[PDB]
PDB file of C-alpha atoms and ligand atoms in Angstrom:
ATOM      1  CA  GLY G   1       0.000   0.000   0.000  1.00 25.89           C
ATOM      2  CA  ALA G   2       1.066   3.550  -0.748  1.00 26.58           C
ATOM      3  CA  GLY G   3      -0.591   6.847   0.179  1.00 27.05           C
ATOM      4  CA  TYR G   4       0.136  10.513   0.742  1.00 27.00           C
ATOM      5  CA  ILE G   5       0.279  11.774   4.345  1.00 28.95           C
ATOM      6  CA  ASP G   6       0.551  15.477   5.256  1.00 26.36           C
ATOM      7  CA  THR G   7       3.521  15.037   7.669  1.00 26.44           C
ATOM      8  CA  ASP G   8       4.494  18.700   8.422  1.00 25.52           C
ATOM      9  CA  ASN G   9       0.883  19.997   8.220  1.00 24.90           C
ATOM     10  CA  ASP G  10       1.493  22.412   5.372  1.00 25.75           C
ATOM     11  CA  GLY G  11      -2.069  21.678   4.206  1.00 25.31           C
ATOM     12  CA  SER G  12      -0.570  21.083   0.772  1.00 24.15           C
ATOM     13  CA  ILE G  13       0.051  17.436  -0.290  1.00 25.87           C
ATOM     14  CA  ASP G  14       3.708  17.338  -1.481  1.00 26.13           C
ATOM     15  CA  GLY G  15       6.062  14.982  -3.384  1.00 27.05           C
ATOM     16  CA  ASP G  16       8.222  14.049  -0.377  1.00 26.30           C
ATOM     17  CA  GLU G  17       4.988  12.874   1.297  1.00 23.52           C
ATOM     18  CA  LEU G  18       4.421   9.670  -0.620  1.00 24.31           C
ATOM     19  CA  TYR G  19       4.772   6.969   2.046  1.00 23.43           C
ATOM     20  CA  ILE G  20       4.931   3.235   1.343  1.00 23.84           C
ATOM     21  CA  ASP G  21       3.401   0.473   3.504  1.00 24.40           C
ATOM     22  CA  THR G  22       5.090  -2.831   2.469  1.00 22.16           C
ATOM     23  CA  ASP G  23       3.384  -5.022   5.162  1.00 23.59           C
ATOM     24  CA  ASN G  24      -0.107  -3.690   4.346  1.00 22.30           C
ATOM     25  CA  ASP G  25      -0.836  -3.321   8.107  1.00 23.03           C
ATOM     26  CA  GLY G  26      -2.050   0.293   8.106  1.00 24.07           C
ATOM     27  CA  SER G  27       1.251   1.899   9.173  1.00 26.49           C
ATOM     28  CA  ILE G  28       4.798   2.959   8.173  1.00 32.95           C
ATOM     29  CA  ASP G  29       7.593   1.891  10.598  1.00 33.06           C
ATOM     30  CA  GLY G  30      11.264   2.908  10.649  1.00 33.28           C
ATOM     31  CA  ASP G  31      12.271   0.270   8.096  1.00 33.84           C
ATOM     32  CA  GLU G  32       9.551   1.306   5.590  1.00 34.16           C
ATOM     33  CA  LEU G  33      10.814   4.876   5.571  1.00 37.00           C
ATOM     34  CA  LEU G  34      13.404   3.538   3.091  1.00 32.06           C
ATOM     35  CA  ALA G  35      10.789   1.805   0.907  1.00 32.50           C
ATOM     36  CA  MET G  36      10.634   2.839  -2.736  1.00 32.75           C
ATOM     37  CA  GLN G  37       8.859   2.227  -6.000  1.00 31.34           C
ATOM     38  CA  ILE G  38      10.626   0.471  -8.841  1.00 30.69           C
ATOM     39  CA  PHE G  39       9.302  -0.282 -12.314  1.00 31.38           C
ATOM     40  CA  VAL G  40       9.366  -3.671 -14.041  1.00 31.31           C
ATOM     41  CA  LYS G  41       8.957  -3.601 -17.824  1.00 29.99           C
ATOM     42  CA  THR G  42       7.412  -6.899 -18.973  1.00 31.13           C
ATOM     43  CA  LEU G  43       7.134  -8.485 -22.424  1.00 30.82           C
ATOM     44  CA  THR G  44       3.396  -7.868 -22.813  1.00 32.16           C
ATOM     45  CA  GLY G  45       4.238  -4.115 -22.748  1.00 32.74           C
ATOM     46  CA  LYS G  46       2.645  -3.886 -19.294  1.00 34.09           C
ATOM     47  CA  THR G  47       4.763  -2.065 -16.728  1.00 34.55           C
ATOM     48  CA  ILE G  48       4.463  -3.191 -13.098  1.00 37.98           C
ATOM     49  CA  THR G  49       5.012  -0.769 -10.218  1.00 36.77           C
ATOM     50  CA  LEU G  50       6.635  -2.528  -7.262  1.00 35.20           C
ATOM     51  CA  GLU G  51       6.828  -1.576  -3.596  1.00 39.41           C
ATOM     52  CA  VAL G  52      10.207  -2.718  -2.304  1.00 40.27           C
ATOM     53  CA  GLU G  53      12.996  -1.949   0.139  1.00 36.61           C
ATOM     54  CA  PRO G  54      16.712  -1.786  -0.706  1.00 36.76           C
ATOM     55  CA  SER G  55      17.189  -4.870   1.535  1.00 37.45           C
ATOM     56  CA  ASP G  56      14.777  -7.003  -0.539  1.00 35.93           C
ATOM     57  CA  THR G  57      16.362  -9.994  -2.303  1.00 34.16           C
ATOM     58  CA  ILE G  58      15.763 -10.533  -6.001  1.00 36.08           C
ATOM     59  CA  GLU G  59      13.895 -13.662  -4.972  1.00 37.89           C
ATOM     60  CA  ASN G  60      11.565 -11.414  -2.912  1.00 36.88           C
ATOM     61  CA  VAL G  61      11.206  -9.097  -5.895  1.00 34.62           C
ATOM     62  CA  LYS G  62      10.135 -12.100  -8.048  1.00 34.10           C
ATOM     63  CA  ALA G  63       7.657 -13.235  -5.392  1.00 35.20           C
ATOM     64  CA  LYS G  64       6.018  -9.796  -5.530  1.00 34.07           C
ATOM     65  CA  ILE G  65       5.737 -10.081  -9.339  1.00 32.99           C
ATOM     66  CA  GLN G  66       3.852 -13.347  -8.848  1.00 34.77           C
ATOM     67  CA  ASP G  67       1.505 -11.744  -6.276  1.00 32.95           C
ATOM     68  CA  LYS G  68       0.657  -9.001  -8.812  1.00 36.36           C
ATOM     69  CA  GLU G  69       0.870 -10.784 -12.213  1.00 37.90           C
ATOM     70  CA  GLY G  70       0.424 -14.532 -11.527  1.00 37.32           C
ATOM     71  CA  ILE G  71       3.818 -15.385 -13.042  1.00 36.83           C
ATOM     72  CA  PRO G  72       5.853 -18.146 -11.301  1.00 37.71           C
ATOM     73  CA  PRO G  73       9.373 -17.102 -10.141  1.00 38.18           C
ATOM     74  CA  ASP G  74      10.843 -20.077 -12.018  1.00 39.26           C
ATOM     75  CA  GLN G  75       9.629 -18.441 -15.274  1.00 40.34           C
ATOM     76  CA  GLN G  76      11.164 -15.084 -14.291  1.00 44.35           C
ATOM     77  CA  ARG G  77      14.545 -13.631 -15.070  1.00 45.04           C
ATOM     78  CA  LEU G  78      15.219 -10.008 -14.150  1.00 42.40           C
ATOM     79  CA  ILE G  79      17.701  -7.611 -15.808  1.00 42.69           C
ATOM     80  CA  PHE G  80      19.014  -4.198 -14.640  1.00 44.62           C
ATOM     81  CA  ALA G  81      21.195  -2.151 -17.049  1.00 45.54           C
ATOM     82  CA  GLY G  82      22.705  -5.292 -18.555  1.00 46.48           C
ATOM     83  CA  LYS G  83      23.608  -7.319 -15.406  1.00 49.61           C
ATOM     84  CA  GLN G  84      21.163 -10.235 -14.951  1.00 49.78           C
ATOM     85  CA  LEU G  85      20.039 -10.406 -11.307  1.00 52.39           C
ATOM     86  CA  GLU G  86      21.001 -13.232  -8.919  1.00 53.56           C
ATOM     87  CA  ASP G  87      18.122 -14.459  -6.689  1.00 53.37           C
ATOM     88  CA  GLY G  88      20.070 -14.149  -3.403  1.00 53.51           C
ATOM     89  CA  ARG G  89      21.457 -10.666  -3.924  1.00 54.08           C
ATOM     90  CA  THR G  90      19.638  -7.514  -2.795  1.00 55.55           C
ATOM     91  CA  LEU G  91      18.422  -4.424  -4.638  1.00 52.96           C
ATOM     92  CA  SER G  92      21.062  -2.507  -2.676  1.00 53.36           C
ATOM     93  CA  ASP G  93      23.797  -4.902  -3.872  1.00 51.36           C
ATOM     94  CA  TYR G  94      22.990  -3.911  -7.435  1.00 49.00           C
ATOM     95  CA  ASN G  95      22.505  -0.253  -6.450  1.00 47.95           C
ATOM     96  CA  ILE G  96      18.882  -0.427  -7.643  1.00 50.46           C
ATOM     97  CA  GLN G  97      17.188   2.758  -6.425  1.00 49.44           C
ATOM     98  CA  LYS G  98      13.785   4.539  -6.478  1.00 46.80           C
ATOM     99  CA  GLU G  99      12.074   4.576  -9.849  1.00 47.77           C
ATOM    100  CA  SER G 100      14.693   2.317 -11.423  1.00 47.61           C
ATOM    101  CA  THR G 101      13.536   0.211 -14.341  1.00 44.33           C
ATOM    102  CA  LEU G 102      14.040  -3.577 -14.265  1.00 44.48           C
ATOM    103  CA  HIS G 103      13.479  -5.711 -17.350  1.00 48.75           C
ATOM    104  CA  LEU G 104      11.487  -8.937 -16.857  1.00 46.15           C
ATOM    105  CA  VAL G 105      12.392 -11.504 -19.566  1.00 45.65           C
ATOM    106  CA  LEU G 106      11.259 -15.151 -19.906  1.00 47.18           C
ATOM    107  CA  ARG G 107      13.581 -17.748 -18.277  1.00 47.27           C
ATOM    108  CA  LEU G 108      14.328 -20.787 -20.490  1.00 47.27           C
ATOM    109  CA  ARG G 109      16.536 -23.637 -19.183  1.00 45.81           C
ATOM    110  CA  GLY G 110      18.874 -25.798 -21.308  1.00 45.09           C
TER     111      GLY G 110
HETATM  112 GD1   GD K 201       2.761  19.034   3.068  1.00 43.59          GD
HETATM  113 GD1   GD K 202       3.941  -1.463   7.813  1.00 42.47          GD
END
């Protein structure tokens, strides 16, 4: 879940006020302050917006794609600026940051 919250009480909803609730439990904790949105460009042309943290593993990222799109992780390979992404590494390992684009290609074995 994501929503705007008027933290500062300007009365004017601002860009630095998009908050992201990863757990979907109604709140943002200290860890979710670092949450971000990344984009995943698929082959159907559809672009998926993902809610992630820099500590998320690529395997987690793939699990989230399945929640949203129904695609099994075994069928998923992710690419970021050339480097294909290893399941056990994190978004931070690859220096994947807010509003980065990942490419989702089709995994074929052998
Ligand atoms: Gd504000
Ligand atoms: Gd939360």
